[PDB]
Structure 1
Amino acid sequence: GSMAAHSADLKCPTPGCDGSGHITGNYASHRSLSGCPRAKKSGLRV
């Protein structure tokens, strides 16, 4: 992606999210906050 996380583009920016799935539910995984199905979704940082 354009804006990843400290863990590189191996996972997505959101710490509470892992990178697999989508808020959409139409893909397998993502690497940015654009696909985070948990994007600041209550469990934003655990």
Structure 2
Amino acid sequence: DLKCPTPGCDGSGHITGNYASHRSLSGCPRA
């Protein structure tokens, strides 16, 4: 999507640290 489906998730970050910014449920920093 154009942004993570998670309301509280901004998308600028990651859990493991494989991305700096994303727009999916691929390791949402703030889920």
Give the gaps of 5 or more residues in structure 2: none
Matched residue pairs, number? 31
Please give the per-residue CA displacement for 1:4-44, whole angstroms capped at 9, x wherever unaligned. Answer: xxxxx3211111010111111232111111220112xxxxx
Q: Segments of 4+ in structure 1 off by > 3 A? A: none
TM-score normalized with structure 1 length: 0.51
Bigger relative contact order, structure 1 or 2, given CA contacts below 8 A and separation 6+?
A: 2
**What RMSD, in angstroms, separates the aligned Cα atoms of the two structures?**
1.3
Residue identity (%): 100
Larger radius of gyration: 1
